[PDB]
Design an enzyme around this catalytic site. Structure first.
Site, PDB file in Angstrom:
ATOM      1  N   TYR A 259       0.290  -1.205  -0.148  1.00  0.00           N
ATOM      2  CA  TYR A 259      -0.151  -0.291   0.121  1.00  0.00           C
ATOM      3  C   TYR A 259       0.633   1.435  -0.061  1.00  0.00           C
ATOM      4  O   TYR A 259       0.072   2.624  -0.902  1.00  0.00           O
ATOM      5  CB  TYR A 259      -1.509  -0.060   1.090  1.00  0.00           C
ATOM      6  CG  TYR A 259      -2.576  -0.968   0.984  1.00  0.00           C
ATOM      7  CD1 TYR A 259      -3.690  -0.850  -0.148  1.00  0.00           C
ATOM      8  CD2 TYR A 259      -1.928  -2.517   1.047  1.00  0.00           C
ATOM      9  CE1 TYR A 259      -4.516  -1.968  -0.084  1.00  0.00           C
ATOM     10  CE2 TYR A 259      -2.990  -3.532   1.283  1.00  0.00           C
ATOM     11  CZ  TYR A 259      -4.268  -2.474   0.528  1.00  0.00           C
ATOM     12  OH  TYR A 259      -4.666  -3.345  -0.119  1.00  0.00           O
TER      13      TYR A 259
ATOM     14  N   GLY B 111       2.225   4.206  -1.686  1.00  0.00           N
ATOM     15  CA  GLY B 111       2.646   4.524  -2.998  1.00  0.00           C
ATOM     16  C   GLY B 111       1.780   4.433  -3.280  1.00  0.00           C
ATOM     17  O   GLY B 111       0.730   4.240  -3.053  1.00  0.00           O
TER      18      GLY B 111
ATOM     19  N   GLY C  12      -1.808   4.158  -5.110  1.00  0.00           N
ATOM     20  CA  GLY C  12      -2.217   2.158  -5.645  1.00  0.00           C
ATOM     21  C   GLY C  12      -2.231   1.610  -4.355  1.00  0.00           C
ATOM     22  O   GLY C  12      -1.808   2.324  -3.312  1.00  0.00           O
TER      23      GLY C  12
ATOM     24  N   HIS D  98      -4.434   5.239   5.446  1.00  0.00           N
ATOM     25  CA  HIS D  98      -4.606   6.746   4.422  1.00  0.00           C
ATOM     26  C   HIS D  98      -4.888   6.547   3.418  1.00  0.00           C
ATOM     27  O   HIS D  98      -5.461   7.958   3.164  1.00  0.00           O
ATOM     28  CB  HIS D  98      -2.474   7.156   4.688  1.00  0.00           C
ATOM     29  CG  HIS D  98      -2.599   8.477   4.028  1.00  0.00           C
ATOM     30  ND1 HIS D  98      -2.004   8.629   2.946  1.00  0.00           N
ATOM     31  CD2 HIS D  98      -3.074   9.643   4.769  1.00  0.00           C
ATOM     32  CE1 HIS D  98      -2.390   9.590   2.863  1.00  0.00           C
ATOM     33  NE2 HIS D  98      -2.466  10.357   3.473  1.00  0.00           N
ATOM     34  N   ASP D  99      -4.948   5.364   2.832  1.00  0.00           N
ATOM     35  CA  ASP D  99      -5.468   5.105   1.421  1.00  0.00           C
ATOM     36  C   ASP D  99      -6.992   5.022   1.768  1.00  0.00           C
ATOM     37  O   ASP D  99      -7.227   6.220   0.856  1.00  0.00           O
ATOM     38  CB  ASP D  99      -5.093   3.825   0.419  1.00  0.00           C
ATOM     39  CG  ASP D  99      -3.325   4.104  -0.047  1.00  0.00           C
ATOM     40  OD1 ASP D  99      -2.882   4.399   0.486  1.00  0.00           O
ATOM     41  OD2 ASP D  99      -3.627   2.953  -0.182  1.00  0.00           O
TER      42      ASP D  99
ATOM     43  N   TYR E 296      -8.194   9.181   2.515  1.00  0.00           N
ATOM     44  CA  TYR E 296      -8.592   9.431   1.302  1.00  0.00           C
ATOM     45  C   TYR E 296      -9.240   8.987   0.196  1.00  0.00           C
ATOM     46  O   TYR E 296     -10.255  10.269  -0.240  1.00  0.00           O
ATOM     47  CB  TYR E 296      -7.082   9.685  -0.328  1.00  0.00           C
ATOM     48  CG  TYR E 296      -5.764  10.521   0.641  1.00  0.00           C
ATOM     49  CD1 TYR E 296      -5.814  11.212   1.738  1.00  0.00           C
ATOM     50  CD2 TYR E 296      -4.999  10.887  -0.360  1.00  0.00           C
ATOM     51  CE1 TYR E 296      -5.095  12.123   2.090  1.00  0.00           C
ATOM     52  CE2 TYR E 296      -3.748  11.377  -0.729  1.00  0.00           C
ATOM     53  CZ  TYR E 296      -3.561  11.926   1.264  1.00  0.00           C
ATOM     54  OH  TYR E 296      -2.948  12.861   0.838  1.00  0.00           O
TER      55      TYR E 296
ATOM     56  N   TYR F  34      -3.960  22.670   2.763  1.00  0.00           N
ATOM     57  CA  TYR F  34      -4.498  22.883   3.637  1.00  0.00           C
ATOM     58  C   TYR F  34      -3.556  24.076   4.693  1.00  0.00           C
ATOM     59  O   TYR F  34      -2.493  23.916   3.732  1.00  0.00           O
ATOM     60  CB  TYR F  34      -4.925  21.346   4.428  1.00  0.00           C
ATOM     61  CG  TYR F  34      -3.735  20.522   4.462  1.00  0.00           C
ATOM     62  CD1 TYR F  34      -2.653  20.828   5.452  1.00  0.00           C
ATOM     63  CD2 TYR F  34      -3.733  19.493   3.850  1.00  0.00           C
ATOM     64  CE1 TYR F  34      -1.692  19.990   5.209  1.00  0.00           C
ATOM     65  CE2 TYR F  34      -3.113  18.896   3.576  1.00  0.00           C
ATOM     66  CZ  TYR F  34      -1.734  18.641   4.179  1.00  0.00           C
ATOM     67  OH  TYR F  34      -0.549  17.879   5.123  1.00  0.00           O
TER      68      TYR F  34
ATOM     69  N   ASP G   4      -3.248  13.182   6.834  1.00  0.00           N
ATOM     70  CA  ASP G   4      -2.066  13.038   6.586  1.00  0.00           C
ATOM     71  C   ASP G   4      -1.479  13.290   7.762  1.00  0.00           C
ATOM     72  O   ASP G   4      -0.404  12.449   7.858  1.00  0.00           O
ATOM     73  CB  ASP G   4      -1.943  14.298   5.930  1.00  0.00           C
ATOM     74  CG  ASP G   4      -1.887  14.300   4.436  1.00  0.00           C
ATOM     75  OD1 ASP G   4      -1.608  15.751   4.166  1.00  0.00           O
ATOM     76  OD2 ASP G   4      -2.659  13.133   3.822  1.00  0.00           O
TER      77      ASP G   4
HETATM   78  C1  LIG Z   1       3.551  11.677  -3.621  1.00  0.00           C
HETATM   79  C2  LIG Z   1       4.105  12.583  -1.675  1.00  0.00           C
HETATM   80  C3  LIG Z   1       5.552  12.435  -1.383  1.00  0.00           C
HETATM   81  C4  LIG Z   1       5.334  11.071  -1.124  1.00  0.00           C
HETATM   82  C5  LIG Z   1       5.190  10.742   0.193  1.00  0.00           C
HETATM   83  C6  LIG Z   1       5.328   8.598   0.711  1.00  0.00           C
HETATM   84  C7  LIG Z   1       4.534   8.316   0.113  1.00  0.00           C
HETATM   85  C8  LIG Z   1       3.821   7.230   2.035  1.00  0.00           C
HETATM   86  C9  LIG Z   1       2.271   6.678   1.125  1.00  0.00           C
HETATM   87  C10 LIG Z   1       1.583   6.472   2.266  1.00  0.00           C
HETATM   88  C11 LIG Z   1       0.014   6.142   2.360  1.00  0.00           C
HETATM   89  C12 LIG Z   1      -0.177   6.137   0.465  1.00  0.00           C
HETATM   90  O1  LIG Z   1      -0.131   5.504  -0.604  1.00  0.00           O
HETATM   91  N1  LIG Z   1      -0.829   7.505   0.158  1.00  0.00           N
HETATM   92  C13 LIG Z   1      -1.577   7.409  -0.543  1.00  0.00           C
HETATM   93  C14 LIG Z   1      -1.365   9.445  -1.119  1.00  0.00           C
HETATM   94  C15 LIG Z   1       1.284   9.398  -1.386  1.00  0.00           C
HETATM   95  C16 LIG Z   1       0.936   8.420  -2.766  1.00  0.00           C
HETATM   96  C17 LIG Z   1       0.826   9.170  -3.458  1.00  0.00           C
HETATM   97  C18 LIG Z   1      -2.831   7.645  -1.021  1.00  0.00           C
HETATM   98  O2  LIG Z   1      -3.322   7.717  -2.182  1.00  0.00           O
HETATM   99  P1  LIG Z   1      -3.387   6.596  -3.191  1.00  0.00           P
HETATM  100  O3  LIG Z   1      -3.901   7.107  -4.563  1.00  0.00           O
HETATM  101  O4  LIG Z   1      -2.321   4.982  -3.462  1.00  0.00           O
HETATM  102  O5  LIG Z   1      -4.713   6.195  -2.336  1.00  0.00           O
HETATM  103  C19 LIG Z   1      -5.601   6.975  -3.259  1.00  0.00           C
HETATM  104  C20 LIG Z   1      -7.743   6.851  -1.964  1.00  0.00           C
HETATM  105  O6  LIG Z   1      -7.932   5.194  -2.783  1.00  0.00           O
HETATM  106 CA   LIG Z   2      -6.829  24.973  -0.648  1.00  0.00          CA
HETATM  107 CA   LIG Z   3      -1.654   4.003  -1.514  1.00  0.00          CA
END
Ligand SMILES: CCCCCCCCCCCC(=O)N[C@H](CCCC)COP(=O)(O)OCCO
Ligand SMILES: [Ca+2]
Ligand SMILES: [Ca+2]
Ligand SMILES: CCCCCCCCCCCC(=O)N[C@H](CCCC)COP(=O)(O)OCCO
Ligand SMILES: [Ca+2]
Lengths: 119, 119
Positions: B28, B30, B32, B48-49, B52, B68, B94
């Protein structure tokens, strides 16, 4: 957003009290505005008003409550190049207004102006 | 917004390099994500995914690009109470992840995991 604007004026003009100094000044400084700007500061204000007005042209772009990312490396305001279009626009409007206020004369006679009669 | 999240992790974990450290970790961490999270860290990422994923219930709320207002109090993370609903929600997602990452063991073997086979 409005809260960030207040702070940005402080960055540009460290010894200012934005709400006390800038609000309710001229015909344009503060919520709303009409007529002809009484002076230089006022015009700074009218241009911010119009800057906000062009923004409500970006879909779902609301200037009073749209939070952006900015910094203050003292007296110098920087709008994060990473802000989305809407946030960018609004940050510019604010940054400009702040710099404009910092470079304009302040007539005490224009503070709390009688708008119904001089506007 | 994503750029702000990067800085938000650095704050809760000063010696980190979020992009080189947590991206492409587990199933998870990154863009996707799928399967069952391989570890605690991986679990912080799934959460976190999905935080979002929920954000997309609020109207016009785009997690990746909505900036924000927040600040870093020396390790401690504070989401500005002045944020609008969409900003506040995303700020929280976040902030919770950053704290989560702080507290979870990091398994270097989980870095660049063969997703296609383990997830
Ligand atoms: C890119 C910015 C600096 C990078 C920080 C390092 C990545 C950390 C990942 C934390 C969880 C995750 O994967 N959260 C993501 C976003 C961050 C990585 C792109 C949710 O976004 P995702 O599309 O996977 O899920 C969307 C909703 O299901
Ligand atoms: Ca804003
Ligand atoms: Ca992810
Ligand atoms: C809120 C506290 C932040 C600091 C305020 C101090 C001075 C503000 C005056 C600048 C011009 C103005 O009047 N700008 C306003 C924003 C300030 C509202 C009080 C644009 O908004 P206004 O609705 O008048 O114009 C929008 C329509 O064009
Ligand atoms: Ca005005």
């Amino acid at each position: 957003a409005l809260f960030q604007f207040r702070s940005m004026i402080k960055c540009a003009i460290p010894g200012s009290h934005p709400l006390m100094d800038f609000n309710n000044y001229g015909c344009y400084c503060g919520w709303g505005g009409s007529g002809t700007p009484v002076d230089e500061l006022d015009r700074c204000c009218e241009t911010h008003d119009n800057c906000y007005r062009d923004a409500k042209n970006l879909s779902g772009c609301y200037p009073y409550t749209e939070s952006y990312s900015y910094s203050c490396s003292n007296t110098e305001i920087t709008c994060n190049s990473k802000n989305n279009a809407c946030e960018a626009f609004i940050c510019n409007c604010d940054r400009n207004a702040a710099i404009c206020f910092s470079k304009a004369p302040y007539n005490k006679e224009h503070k709390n102006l009688d708008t119904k009669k001089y506007c």
